[PDB]
Paper text:
The full-length SlpX_ac shows differences in structure and domain arrangement compared to the SlpA architecture. SlpX_ac_I accommodates a similar fold to both SlpA_II, with SlpX_ac_I being slightly larger. Likewise, SlpX_ac_I is structurally conserved (RMSD: 2.6 Å) to SlpA_ac_II, indicating the possible dimer formation as observed for SlpA_ac_I. Therefore, the SlpX homodimer might be incorporated within the assembled SlpA layer via the two described interfaces.
Residue numbers in the entry: 56 to 182
Write the structure that this text describes.
């Protein structure tokens, strides 16, 4: 009766003893220099739904942006704050430099009865 994610409405499996990569989504999110962090999070969030138990309707995953950027940074992405050119513009965070190697982003959520589900989403740099 476990909580679970879907990605574009496909049920994502658990990591199992036999298949420890059972929760790696069959997708790739591409990213490149100048991509807005908000746009990458939006792409992931549109695709991912969490289910707090086996029969529950899907709910939006809310991805913490600080956690997300720290995952990017640990995996060789450098991040820039693009500064506003005057007081009427807003700063935003964007991909600065990309690594050569793919990596997974980890997303977890806690459902009913403090049961946690985790999925891994592959990130593909374009150079």
């Amino acid at each position: 009766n476990k909580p679970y994610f879907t990605y574009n409405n496909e049920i994502i499996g658990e990591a199992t003893q036999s298949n420890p990569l059972g929760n790696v989504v069959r997708t790739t999110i591409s990213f490149k220099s100048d991509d807005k962090v908000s746009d990458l999070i939006s792409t992931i969030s549109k695709a991912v739904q969490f289910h707090k138990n086996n029969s529950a309707s899907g709910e939006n995953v809310t991805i913490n942006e600080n956690d997300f950027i720290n995952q990017l940074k640990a995996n060789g992405v450098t991040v820039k704050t693009v500064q506003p050119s005057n007081k009427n513009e807003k700063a935003y965070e964007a991909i600065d430099k990309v690594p050569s190697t793919s990596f997974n982003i980890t997303l977890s959520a806690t459902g009913d009865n403090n049961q946690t589900a985790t999925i891994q989403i592959p990130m593909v740099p374009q150079g």
